[PDB]
């Protein structure tokens, strides 16, 4: 299930950066950014394979990819933020 909605302005500034790269279709910091997200645990609504894609939300000072990501849904303005490594998700509202 989705944990409600959250304004983009209420997320880390890196979330905004990630959405800007997605808008320009890259380039991304990680060649894997953009890979299909399976939604294997069905946390997000059920959709066909390829409906979702995952992108890194950089964590300051991290040597790894961290636990922050943005999962895009193919629908317009459909984006999910996870700060706990795919455990929970919140719908991102870019209008606030």
Curated annotation (Swiss-Prot):
<keyword id="KW-1015">Disulfide bond</keyword>
<keyword id="KW-0378">Hydrolase</keyword>
<feature type="active site" description="Proton donor">
    <location>
        <position position="85"/>
    </location>
</feature>
<feature type="disulfide bond">
    <location>
        <begin position="7"/>
        <end position="96"/>
    </location>
</feature>
<keyword id="KW-0540">Nuclease</keyword>
<keyword id="KW-0964">Secreted</keyword>
<dbReference type="GO" id="GO:0046589">
    <property type="term" value="F:ribonuclease T1 activity"/>
</dbReference>
<dbReference type="InterPro" id="IPR016191">
    <property type="entry name" value="Ribonuclease/ribotoxin"/>
</dbReference>
<feature type="active site" description="Proton acceptor">
    <location>
        <position position="54"/>
    </location>
</feature>
<dbReference type="GO" id="GO:0005576">
    <property type="term" value="C:extracellular region"/>
</dbReference>
<dbReference type="GO" id="GO:0003723">
    <property type="term" value="F:RNA binding"/>
</dbReference>
<dbReference type="GO" id="GO:0016829">
    <property type="term" value="F:lyase activity"/>
</dbReference>
<dbReference type="Pfam" id="PF00545">
    <property type="entry name" value="Ribonuclease"/>
</dbReference>
<keyword id="KW-0456">Lyase</keyword>
<protein>
    <recommendedName>
        <fullName>Guanyl-specific ribonuclease Sa</fullName>
        <ecNumber>4.6.1.24</ecNumber>
    </recommendedName>
</protein>
<dbReference type="InterPro" id="IPR000026">
    <property type="entry name" value="N1-like"/>
</dbReference>
<comment type="similarity">
    <text>Belongs to the ribonuclease N1/T1 family.</text>
</comment>
<dbReference type="GO" id="GO:0004521">
    <property type="term" value="F:RNA endonuclease activity"/>
</dbReference>
<keyword id="KW-0255">Endonuclease</keyword>
